[PDB]
Amino acid sequence: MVLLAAAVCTKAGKAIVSRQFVEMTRTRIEGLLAAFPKLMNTGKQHTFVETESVRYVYQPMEKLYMVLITTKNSNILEDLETLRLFSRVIPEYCRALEENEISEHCFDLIFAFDEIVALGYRENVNLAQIRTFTEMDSHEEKVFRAVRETQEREAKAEMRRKAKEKEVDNFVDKLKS
């Protein structure tokens, strides 16, 4: 993990959608987080705030915020890419932007979190390709036609049966000393 939740946010004091990598507690962790986020703490601007060693990572994208959270150190850029990246992905994933579309393609969207990121690891590239992996496959089909068919033959037949029946060193020395 490098993120116990990704929650995609809309301005509302409320985060439009979320997923809980790990359950234990109740929303109050998440619920409390939601509250704080909605409040924004009046704070003016800035796309990042970490407070109390918790990264609250966000990106306004419009009236929307996409949010990630973490507490101990990270390499920034990567991160950014993601926020941004989210901001690339959605109109594809759930269709454009307005909660509803997403409301219909919730399943798709959550699926995307997992898919995209396996526990804080940047899994791939290529969205379409990303579609590919599941509920879009190939193997299963290959297998099915042949198999189904084979069985079918047995069945058909059955129908009848039925039917009828240097450098290092510089350092090293210095140090060594």
Binding site: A118, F133, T134, E135, H139, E140, V143, E167, F171, L175
Partner: protein, 290 residues
């Protein structure tokens, strides 16, 4: 006397899957509250072992996952073993994505009577030429290691040998992450091996070692040279990530005036290069510590 639970039931017929989808969403929302009162279980039960609807299964499944399962019925609703056999098959499924997806789920999953021969089952699935599937096992296993590590007991080595068989960086990266959590030692042995090779390689896996090494010294040291030999190589350092860590780890390790200088430089340039201010501040903070 009658209820809309039933109203949903006919819809499902009416559409098939489609209607059911709707039902899932509703159910979901209903579920979302907590809320539901049972009975549809039966329906679900009835149609689903004989039905496909993959997506739906995925919805279903997930639903099961998020929702409880040690349900006041048991534990299980009590069928947690029987239905699974199809699923086990799916899990068996020659069909690799399908297994992988399951696996993904499975990493989320943790339902034991079902697991046991699925332990066998999984083992087979590891062999499948797909790194996606195999990788998925790495999470899954991780999931075991806390829940019922023991379930499998021979693993840390088994993995470690596995690594030997292995060569997909993605999977490797993972492999490390888990491996040290099981036991560092194996990683280390390998570490010894890898020492020269590292430089050639992709970062992500490299990172993970940096954490590990840290904890052990405060507890105890005497280990250096072998490391050093490498470490110096690491004093190439060049990705912004690498560099970011690389100076950071160094300080962790050392603070010799020479050390002080080395890291310092890295920063200074970095900064200079640097653009995201947020970042800039951060290092200060470290610095502030320093």
């Amino acid at each position: 006397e009658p209820p809309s639970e039933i109203s949903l039931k006919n819809d499902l017929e009416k559409g098939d899957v489609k209607s059911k989808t709707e039902a899932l969403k509703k159910v979901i929302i209903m579920i979302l509250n907590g809320e539901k009162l049972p009975g549809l279980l039966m329906t679900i039960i009835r149609f689903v072992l004989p039905l496909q609807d993959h997506t739906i299964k995925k919805l279903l499944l997930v639903f099961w996952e998020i929702v409880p399962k040690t349900t006041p019925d048991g534990r299980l609703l009590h069928e947690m073993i029987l239905v699974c056999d199809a699923y086990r098959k799916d899990l068996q499924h020659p069909n690799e994505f399908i297994r992988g997806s399951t696996l993904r789920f499975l990493c989320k999953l943790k339902e034991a009577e079902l697991l046991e021969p699925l332990m066998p089952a999984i083992r087979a699935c590891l062999e499948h030429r797909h790194s996606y599937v195999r990788r998925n096992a790495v999470l899954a296993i991780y999931t075991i290691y806390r829940n019922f590590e023991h379930l499998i007991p021979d693993a840390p080595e088994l993995i470690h040998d596995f690594l030997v068989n292995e060569k997909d960086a993605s999977c490797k990266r993972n492999a490390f992450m888990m491996l040290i959590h099981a036991d560092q030692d194996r990683a280390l042995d390998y570490l010894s091996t890898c020492i020269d090779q590292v430089q050639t390689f992709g970062d992500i896996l490299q990172l993970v070692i940096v954490e590990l090494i840290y904890k052990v010294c405060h507890a105890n040291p005497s280990e250096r040279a072998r490391f050093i030999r490498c470490i110096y190589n690491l004093l190439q350092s060049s990705s912004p990530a690498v560099k970011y860590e690389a100076a950071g780890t160094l300080v962790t390790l050392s603070s010799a005036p020479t050390a002080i200088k080395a890291a310092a430089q890295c920063y200074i340039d970095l900064i200079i290069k640097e653009s995201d201010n947020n970042v800039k501040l951060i290092v200060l903070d470290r610095l502030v510590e320093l």
